[PDB]
Paper text:
[name] proteins are programmable nucleases that have defense and regulatory functions in both eukaryotes and prokaryotes. Here, we describe a new class of pAgos that uniquely use DNA guides to process RNA targets. The biochemical and structural analysis of [name] pAgo (PliAgo) reveals an unusual organization of the guide binding pocket that does not rely on divalent cations and the canonical set of contacts for 5’-end interactions. Unconventional interactions of PliAgo with the 5’-phosphate of guide DNA define its new position within pAgo and shift the site of target RNA cleavage in comparison with known Argonautes.
The structure of the binary complex of PliAgo with P-gDNA shows the path of the DNA molecule and its contacts with the MID, PIWI, N and PAZ domains of the protein. The 9th and 10th nucleotides of P-gDNA, which define the cleavage site on target RNA, are positioned in front of the catalytic site of PliAgo. Along its length, guide DNA is oriented within PliAgo through multiple contacts between the DNA backbone and positively charged amino acid residues. These contacts pre-order guide DNA in a nearly A-form conformation from the 1st to 6th nucleotides in the seed region, thus making it optimal for target RNA recognition. The 3D structure of PliAgo in complex with P-gDNA reveals that the 5′-phosphate group is coordinated by residues R467, H498, S501 and Y530, resulting in positioning of the 5′-end DNA base (1T) next to the side chain of Y530. In accordance with biochemical observations, there are no sequence-specific contacts of the 5′-end nucleotide base with PliAgo. In contrast, in PliAgo the 5’-end nucleotide stays outside of the MID pocket and forms stacking interactions with the second nucleotide of guide DNA. The orientation of the guide 5′-end in the complex of PliAgo with P-gDNA differs from all previously characterized Ago-guide complexes, shifting the register of guide DNA by one nucleotide toward the guide 3′-end. As a result, the 1st and subsequent nucleotides in guide DNA in the PliAgo complex superimpose with the 2nd and subsequent guide nucleotides in previously studied pAgos.
Numbering used by the authors: 1 to 769
The structure:
Amino acid sequence: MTLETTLFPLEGTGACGASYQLYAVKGLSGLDETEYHKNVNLLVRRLSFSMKAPFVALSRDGEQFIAVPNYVTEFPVDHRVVRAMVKLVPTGEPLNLRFDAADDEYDGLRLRYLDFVLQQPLFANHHLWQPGSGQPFFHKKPLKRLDDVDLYDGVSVRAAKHPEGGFGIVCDARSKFITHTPIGARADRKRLGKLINRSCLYKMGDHWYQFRIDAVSDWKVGEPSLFEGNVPISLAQQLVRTAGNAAPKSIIDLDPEGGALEYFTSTNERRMAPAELCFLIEDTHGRRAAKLQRQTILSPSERRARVNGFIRRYLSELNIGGAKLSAGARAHAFFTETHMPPALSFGNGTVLAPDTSKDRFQAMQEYSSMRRTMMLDKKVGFFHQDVFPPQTLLLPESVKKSWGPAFASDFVGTVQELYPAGGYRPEIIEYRDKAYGGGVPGQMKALLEVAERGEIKSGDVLVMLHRINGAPRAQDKLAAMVCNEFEKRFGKRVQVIHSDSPGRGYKRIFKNDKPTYVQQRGRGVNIKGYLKGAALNKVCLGNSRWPFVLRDPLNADVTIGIDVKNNMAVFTMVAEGGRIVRVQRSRSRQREQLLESQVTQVITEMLSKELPEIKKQVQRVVIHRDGRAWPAEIAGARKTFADMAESGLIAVDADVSVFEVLKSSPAPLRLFSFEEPTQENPKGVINPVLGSWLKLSENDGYICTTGAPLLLQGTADPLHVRKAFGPMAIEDALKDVFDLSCLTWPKPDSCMRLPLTIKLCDIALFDDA
DNA sequence: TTACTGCACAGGTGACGA
């Protein structure tokens, strides 16, 4: 119940002045509403970088109004490029914003100013450095040396509203891996060329920052490559005359034969840096270094200690102009109620309820384990139990000729034990995986040829693919193409598994004077665990056999997720308790945004199909957007339900609310709870329990969809959800985000960070050609 | 096959810097 945040109060913010002059923009009156705001923030960005001041957008009614810090003297007022030229006309009457007010619509302006100015004292601190604007502040001294690489520890700092009045800071600890020795003056042109698109740390004397390698310079560090006025000058000479005071040796004594890297400014200009002073950023996710990556996962005690250390060390005096500022010693804390997980419905009339006579941790551990054990028990089992329609299992020819048959026997038996009512009995087909080439073309050619001959009877196909890209941070192009083509050209619905994972589960054995494949249980995969998980996710869930659903209504009757990435929009709908659930794809104009018409079409048709199955009059609707929400999207959403309320398909006074689910949060906040201090945990800091939550304002809140009993390591990352429109209170939306995240269908005995709504999108999220 | 913890890559309402 006792919970603490990483929100620190701000002190001395009396006598703080945020002077803006509003302007407004003509441009062309073609408010494309999808091209309009694009250009709005393109110009805001351009001005913020060129003039280096905190330009903001405040969008009232017309949604124009760039806000210009009044302390810039010469202002272009007219701005070129950006399609038709834009004229900036002031709305007179300068603003002088203060931090002791009630809730205004100028709060975005204050937060922008506060963010901008809080990072001058840290930018000036000799012992800190920042990769780039907005990013966290890391110590120059590494936290640790791991062999060839250094582990740097930093803290991110964002301004925010304080729920007990005023403004504060939300911070989080952060990590970065950088190779210890530099690229070096002795590295030749071929080596540097092989580094294009890596990022590196540049120790330009006392000023450290990070940039993306874009090309290799033709001129060496000592050869003339610049102009000082009209005299051609070397990079060495330029770095010398921009050093000051007692400049370090490294910047004034470069090897003249060393090479230089090239990069782009934020304002899009060309610059050089000597390789002698650049240290490659290391990717611990790619080139999968488990031992290194584990160093970045912090216990709650480690996290709290590092965050508070940074606060007390660098945020106790903070001078900005005549301004004296401080960060409170101790973070905001509260007593809160924690949400209980919802009662769930399983097969045969059985309900699972959290037990309230146990302490919250034990009760949550029992409930989570029970989700799996009730799914498996043939006396209770899946909430939705029916026979499957015909099924196909489509295997590569090379697999069918070796270990395919043994895998299929085991998989079929595993499905029948997990879901005894389906009578799973797939027809096994092969495709010629070696006949054409084994890139994405050629695999696709063999899959399509098998589909053309009519060999895939039935509409459900489970297809085993080869893994073309084994590197992480890689989308499965082949799987996306297979789903898209089998849906578009045939009626097929396709789930995917790969060949590497199960193949590691089987070894060839001599039995009865015959070669046979049998299970091997050493290492590389846990084959039983694989068979069970793939049976659940690819066959049961893939045929929409939900193992359990909510017993009680959410605050929302219907709730709809949206994600647009790769010109591939995904709409999702959960209704009743998760008894309805649908998922549609759509080809969007842009890669990551939606036209208002497309929204108001897909949603209307999708919901009209299901409305006769929704046996309660519908009156509250919620949309969960995965990421930023655009107002063309909001307009379409409001229009859909105003129309359906007029018609009578819905309650005449039904309402809509829209919420962005920010999984990477721009203001990352953490929650801690406390136990009795043990010898290992001298302060007794621990994770918050699963249902914990907090709202900072009417528009910003946090739920722990992950938390204490079910996390094995690290500290929980609370989920940030922010309202964008509508009458639903933020607390109610937090509660049923949490209830929707207890529908842990992919892995019943575990916690799950995203609510089921957006969980559907980010797995069905695919590619377009 | 799947769950979280993590960084980064891009990819961003974003100030620096040869």
